[PDB]
Amino acid sequence: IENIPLAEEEHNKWHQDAVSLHLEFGIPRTAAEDIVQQCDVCQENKMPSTLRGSNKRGIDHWQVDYTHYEDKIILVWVETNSGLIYAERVKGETGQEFRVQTMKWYAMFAPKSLQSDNGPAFVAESTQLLMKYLGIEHTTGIPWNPQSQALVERTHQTLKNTLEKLIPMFNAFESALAGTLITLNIKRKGGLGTSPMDIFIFNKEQQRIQQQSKSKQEKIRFCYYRTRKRGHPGEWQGPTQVLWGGDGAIVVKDRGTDRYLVIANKDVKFIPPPK
Amino acid sequence: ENIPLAEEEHNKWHQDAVSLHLEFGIPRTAAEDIVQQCDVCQIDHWQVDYTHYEDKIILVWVETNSGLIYAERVKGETGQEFRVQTMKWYAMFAPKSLQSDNGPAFVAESTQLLMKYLGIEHTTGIPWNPQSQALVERTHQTLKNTLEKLIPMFNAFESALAGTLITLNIKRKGGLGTSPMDIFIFNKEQQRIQQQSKSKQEKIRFCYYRTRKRGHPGEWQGPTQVLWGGDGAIVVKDRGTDRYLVIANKDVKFIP
Amino acid sequence: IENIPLAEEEHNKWHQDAVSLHLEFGIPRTAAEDIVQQCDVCQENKMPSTLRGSNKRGIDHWQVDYTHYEDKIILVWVETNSGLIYAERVKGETGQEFRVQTMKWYAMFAPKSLQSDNGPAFVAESTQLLMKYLGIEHTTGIPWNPQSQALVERTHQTLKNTLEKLIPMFNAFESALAGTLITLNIKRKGGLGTSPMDIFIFNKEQQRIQQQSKSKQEKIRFCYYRTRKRGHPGEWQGPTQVLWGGDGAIVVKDRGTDRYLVIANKDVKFIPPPK
DNA sequence: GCTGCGAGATCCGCTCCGGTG
DNA sequence: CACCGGAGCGGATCTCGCA
DNA sequence: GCTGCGAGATCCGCTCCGGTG
DNA sequence: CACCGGAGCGGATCTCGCA
Numbered sequence: 001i002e003n004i005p006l007a008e009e010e011h012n013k014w015h016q017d018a019v020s021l022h023l024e025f026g027i028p029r030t031a032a033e034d035i036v037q038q039c040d041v042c043q044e045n046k047m048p049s050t051l052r053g054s055n056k057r058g059i060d061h062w063q064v065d066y067t068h069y070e071d072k073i074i075l076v077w078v079e080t081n082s083g084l085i086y087a088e089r090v091k092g093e094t095g096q097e098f099r100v101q102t103m104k105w106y107a108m109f110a111p112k113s114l115q116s117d118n119g120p121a122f123v124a125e126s127t128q129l130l131m132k133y134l135g136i137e138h139t140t141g142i143p144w145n146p147q148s149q150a151l152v153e154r155t156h157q158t159l160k161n162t163l164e165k166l167i168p169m170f171n172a173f174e175s176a177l178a179g180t181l182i183t184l185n186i187k188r189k190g191g192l193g194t195s196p197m198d199i200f201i202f203n204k205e206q207q208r209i210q211q212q213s214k215s216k217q218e219k220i221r222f223c224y225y226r227t228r229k230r231g232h233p234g235e236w237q238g239p240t241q242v243l244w245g246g247d248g249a250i251v252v253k254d255r256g257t258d259r260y261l262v263i264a265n266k267d268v269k270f271i272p273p274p275k
Numbered sequence: 276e277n278i279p280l281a282e283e284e285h286n287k288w289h290q291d292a293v294s295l296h297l298e299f300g301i302p303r304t305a306a307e308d309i310v311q312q313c314d315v316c317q318i319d320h321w322q323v324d325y326t327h328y329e330d331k332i333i334l335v336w337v338e339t340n341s342g343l344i345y346a347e348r349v350k351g352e353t354g355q356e357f358r359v360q361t362m363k364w365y366a367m368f369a370p371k372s373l374q375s376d377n378g379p380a381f382v383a384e385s386t387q388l389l390m391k392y393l394g395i396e397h398t399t400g401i402p403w404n405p406q407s408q409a410l411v412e413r414t415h416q417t418l419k420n421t422l423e424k425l426i427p428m429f430n431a432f433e434s435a436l437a438g439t440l441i442t443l444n445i446k447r448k449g450g451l452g453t454s455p456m457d458i459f460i461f462n463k464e465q466q467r468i469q470q471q472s473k474s475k476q477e478k479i480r481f482c483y484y485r486t487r488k489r490g491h492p493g494e495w496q497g498p499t500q501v502l503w504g505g506d507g508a509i510v511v512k513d514r515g516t517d518r519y520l521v522i523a524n525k526d527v528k529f530i531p
Numbered sequence: 532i533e534n535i536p537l538a539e540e541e542h543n544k545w546h547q548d549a550v551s552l553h554l555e556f557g558i559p560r561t562a563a564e565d566i567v568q569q570c571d572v573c574q575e576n577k578m579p580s581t582l583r584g585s586n587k588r589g590i591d592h593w594q595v596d597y598t599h600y601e602d603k604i605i606l607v608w609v610e611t612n613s614g615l616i617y618a619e620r621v622k623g624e625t626g627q628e629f630r631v632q633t634m635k636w637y638a639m640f641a642p643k644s645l646q647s648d649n650g651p652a653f654v655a656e657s658t659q660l661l662m663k664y665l666g667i668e669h670t671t672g673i674p675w676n677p678q679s680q681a682l683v684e685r686t687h688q689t690l691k692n693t694l695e696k697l698i699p700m701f702n703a704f705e706s707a708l709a710g711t712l713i714t715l716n717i718k719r720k721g722g723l724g725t726s727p728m729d730i731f732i733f734n735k736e737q738q739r740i741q742q743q744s745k746s747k748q749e750k751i752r753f754c755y756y757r758t759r760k761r762g763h764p765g766e767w768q769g770p771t772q773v774l775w776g777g778d779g780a781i782v783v784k785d786r787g788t789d790r791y792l793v794i795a796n797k798d799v800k801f802i803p804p805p806k
Numbered sequence: 807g808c809t810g811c812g813a814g815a816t817c818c819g820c821t822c823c824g825g826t827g
Numbered sequence: 828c829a830c831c832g833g834a835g836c837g838g839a840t841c842t843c844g845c846a
Numbered sequence: 847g848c849t850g851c852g853a854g855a856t857c858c859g860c861t862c863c864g865g866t867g
Numbered sequence: 868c869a870c871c872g873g874a875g876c877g878g879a880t881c882t883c884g885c886a
Contacts, residue, residue, distance in 0.1 A: 014710075015696050016718050017814075023724035028835075033815090041696050049815060049842050052849045065886080100431050107437035108367070110445065110456075142848070146886045150850035157885040158853065165546050165572050172359060178366040179545075186369070187547050188853095193554035201464050208457075230831050232826055548854075559875075564855090580855060580882050583809045596846080673808070677846045681810035688845040689813065719813095761871050763866055 001027065008035055015041050054150060055115065056080045059203045063115035063141075064122075065152040066093055069160055074177070075101055076159060078152045082199035085155050085184055087177055095124040102127070106134055110204075113137040117149055158184060221245075222271040225252050225263045233267060242270075276505050277301065279519040282309050286518055289315040293340070302469040303462060305503060318466060319371035322407055325352060325378070328419055333436070334360050337414050339374070339407045343459040344414055344443055346436055354383040361386070365393055369463070372396040374407065418443065477504055483528035484511050486520070498530055532558065539566055546572050585681060586646065587611045590734045594646035594672075595653075596683040597624055600691055605708070606632055607690060609683045613730035616686050616715055618708055626655040633658070637665055641735075644668040648680055689715060752776075753802040756783050756794045764798060773801075 003025050011021065018032035036042045055061075059081050067074035067087075075098075076087040086105075090097050098121035105111070114136060116122035123140060131138040141148035162180040170176045186195050224236035243251040249264045281299040284290075292306035303318045310316050320339040325332060332352055336345040345364070349356050357380040364370075373390075375381040377399050390397040402408050421439045429435045444456045480501040485493040496513075503510035508523050534556050542552065549563035567573045586592075590612050598605035598618075606629075607618040617636075621628050629652035636642070645667060647653035654671060662669040672679035693711040701707045717726050755767035774782040780795045 013700070014714060014718065016714065019814095020718060020720045020724070023720060030835080045692065045696055047814065047843075051841060054850060055848085068886090096430075100433055103431075103434045103437045107440045107444075139847090145849080147850040148848085149886085151852095153884095153886050154851050154853085160885085161576065161853085165576055169544070171355075175359060175362050178362050181366050183545060183547065185366075187545065187551060189551045189554065190853095193551065198467060201460060201467075204460055205464055228831095230824095230826065230833090232831090550854095561875080578854065578883075582881060585810060586808085599846090670807090676809080678810040679808085680846085682812095684844095684846050685811050685813085691845085692813085721813095759871095761864095761866065761873090763871090 003027070004031065007032070011035055011039055011042075015039070052147070055148070057113070059207055060110065060112035061115070062111060062113075063149050063152055065117060065149050065156070066119065067156060067159075069163065072173075076152060076156060077105060078155045079196065079200065080151055082203055083196035084200045085159070085181065085196070087159065087181055089174060089177060093119070093121050095121050095127060098122070098124075099127055099130055102130070106136075111136060113139070115139055115141060115149070117141050117146075118143040155184070219273070221273060223250065223252065223268055225254070225261075226267050228267065236269075239271075276503075276508050276510065276521055278305055278503055278505075278510055279521050281306075282510075282519040285309050285313060289313065291316070296465075302473065302503075303466050304469065304474075308502075318462070319369070320374060321370055321372070322374050322402070322411055323381070324376075324411055324415070326415055326419075328422065331432070335411075335415065335418075336364060337411055338459070339404075339410065341455055341459045341462055342410070343455040344418070344440070346418070346440060348433055348436060352378075352380055354380050354386055357381075357383075358386055358389060361389070365395075369467075370395060372398070374398050374402070376400070376402060414443075473503055473505065477501065480504075481530040482509065482511065483530060484520075484522045485526050486522075487526065492526065495528060501527075501529075534558070535562065538563070542566055542570055542573075546570070583678070586679070588644070590738055591641065591643035592646070593642060593644075594680050594683055596648060596680050596687070597650065598687060598690075600694065603704075607683060607687060608636060609686045610727065610731065611682055613734055614727035615731045616690070616712065616727070618690065618712055620705060620708060624650070624652050626652050626658060629653070629655075630658055630661055633661070637667075642667060644670070646670055646672060646680070648672050648677075649674040686715070750804070752804060754781065754783065754799055756785070756792075757798050759798065767800075770802075 004027060007021055007025050007027060010016075018029055018036050021027065021032045021035075022029040036046075055063075057080055061081070062077060062079055064075065064077050067076055072089060073091065073093055074087060074089045076085065078085050086108075088101065090101060114131065116138070118140060121127060122138075128138055146153055159180055162183050163176060166179050166183070167173070167176050170179060185197050189195050221242040222239050223242050224239060226233040226236055238255065240252045240254070243253065243260075245251075247265075249262050250268055252261055252263055253259070254261050277299055278301050281295055281301045284299070285295060292303065292310045295301060295309070296303050296306045307318060318340065322337050322339060324335045324337075326335060332349050334345075334347050334349055334357075338344070345367075347360060347363075349360060373395060375398065380386065382399055387397055402411075418439055421442055422435055425438050425442070426432070426435045429438060445454050448454055481498045482501050483495040483497045484499065485495050487493060497511075499511045499514070501509050501511060502519075508521050509527060510519050511522055511527075512519050535558060538552055538556050538558060541547075549560055549567050552558065552563045552566075553560040567577075586594075588611055592612070593608060593610055595606065595608050598607055603620060604622065604624055605618060605620045607616065609616050617639075619632065621632060645662065647669070649671060652658060653669075659669055677684055690711055693714050694707060697710050697714070698704070698707050701710060716728050720726050752773040753770050754773050755770060757764040757767055769786065771783045771785070774784065774791075776782075778796075780793050781799055783792055783794055784790070785792050
């Protein structure tokens, strides 16, 4: 532990990873990793390997991107939760044409939110106003990050493959595109052999708001909750409603965190209802 | 299965297939079959018409029962454009039957060949059903009135048509607040469930059936055709009573 | 099973994967996969996802590639088994200069075989004769496949990083390159904290041929062997020497396969030695 | 008759030690 | 005295980008 | 105040059925 | 009668390349 200054000097001179230094001078690897963190050259030359994710979100939250196939502009519209897709060819990527396509889209379906990249048509102020005009949240992804729209990119690849497989069988490129839409919307099935269109229909049936509104008549009970650390709980903090009661646990909301949280039934006491 | 009970109730009261499946939760196709077989009373059915408005030709697609409608501007009335429109329409929906008049585009040989390729029933001739015809004229009048209503506000003619489609499919409501889109979605969901549960499994198969009296099995009767084979039970008709009964698969001899 | 012709017709028309067809028409998925195999469009558009490998080989089997750093030509020499490396800068990639570098290399170490890409210096007939002149096997990798020399590519990346980290501390670029060689040959240690140079030295000590030659005096025994299929063995095929005897199994060579093979001691009968 | 791999960074599984009821 | 993280040790696992 | 995923192809783990000692 | 692949079923796992 007394050789730590010499280890730091060697790190400054040569800049090897902490594992070798730990195995050599017998210093805990936490100290060596902190040395690497507090150094300069290794800090400047280390790489940020992170996993991140994708915005699957919920029902009716879609994103889109353009298609460059055979020097023809095509719009492909992709669902995230169920997996449905839809596409149509357009002469250009102009704002007015994009607005017309979006209006037809919103006539056909009932979306809620839309994601997109920094494309001029997507970013256009009139398009943003129209999206606001129909009460739909429009968020722009960070520029030069196709992984945000990786879903539409994957669907793009699959649709191009299906066009390659299906184009010579029909007279019209639009007809072939419709056939590929059928292939990837009704025929493309996996797992339980259920179409993305069927998933979307079932999602709409569940999302029907009449049942959700009328479920309010169910009995509501109150309770306290506490947090467990090393098996040692805290105080019974705050009265909150029993959102649902399960076997061995319930569902509660913490106003401090403003998010949903689960507590085992052992740390829960039931409040009797009015009588 | 409550389907044979529904069919007995139909043999008693002779109500329409609509109220039948609404109030007994039975297949729409089964209700149509029962209406067809019931001589007292004797899905995805569409009608297509052409109409001009500022000298523009537009396809009109109206479903005969739920009331959902669809429209799209077209350059001309000729067969190739009709084929493209019907290809897009079949891409967007999953129809089962179509009713139309004797228009050249409808009666074109290649159009009917592509109908057969898609495997859907096509019927041409003079429309004789007031139930569908009057709905067609009502849809036409309402659509033209709403488009005259909404055109000045919108920049694009196609945008105005899309807005009128929104008004006539989502905003407009009837009964307990059910849109044509809502009723179409409900019927489509139930129809697809019953199709995947009953249709593709087996067809036109005969069998032997027996009736249990206080648990005692009866003599094998028939033979009769298996019309609706479900989970652990089938629907067959007793010839004497002209009624359908629930017979468990353990009491059925499958005739090859 | 009678719907197979219709399934084949649908495959010819639309060309979806076998899983969906199997889940739809209730046909065994082997038949559908064979249909896809015997079709044409899916055969033409399927992708060959294979894993392959790398030629780690044994001791003293190396490969090399050139370095394009700061518009300066550098030769980097990489070991595969132990992990040692060595490098030196050269003005150009000419055949004579490469021959001089190889001769210095063979003076410094005692290699056995060398791998390389389609580089003109590596492919030169005089270089091949010189490699033959020193009794070293030279094989050329398939062109335009850097994954064959992925080892030297990885070492290239690491050495460039270490140059970036170490260049300003020395006057001469050659001195910095030597320092990076020290870093990656003596300091870069993992696992048991043992240097690649130490691994190479121990490999040479083990590969010393005197012990291998003098091990022949060990007793040699003969035996038969058989192959097990479903628990049913065959005939006792061929007399072969007991190369080594272990606990529950031995080592034998099959002249039919001309490779080494292991048989459990249960299927082995010991031949008594001469007495 | 031939051939993708490894530095680097957090997280976690874990085991003696700890607080902890 | 049982129990769970705490810390240390060791291993498991992710993208990336070199040619 | 934000965000890589999924068609496609072999191999394998496995469970009733089989040969098999 | 125990035992191991055989075949079928289902799941586990690999690179790649789309923008």
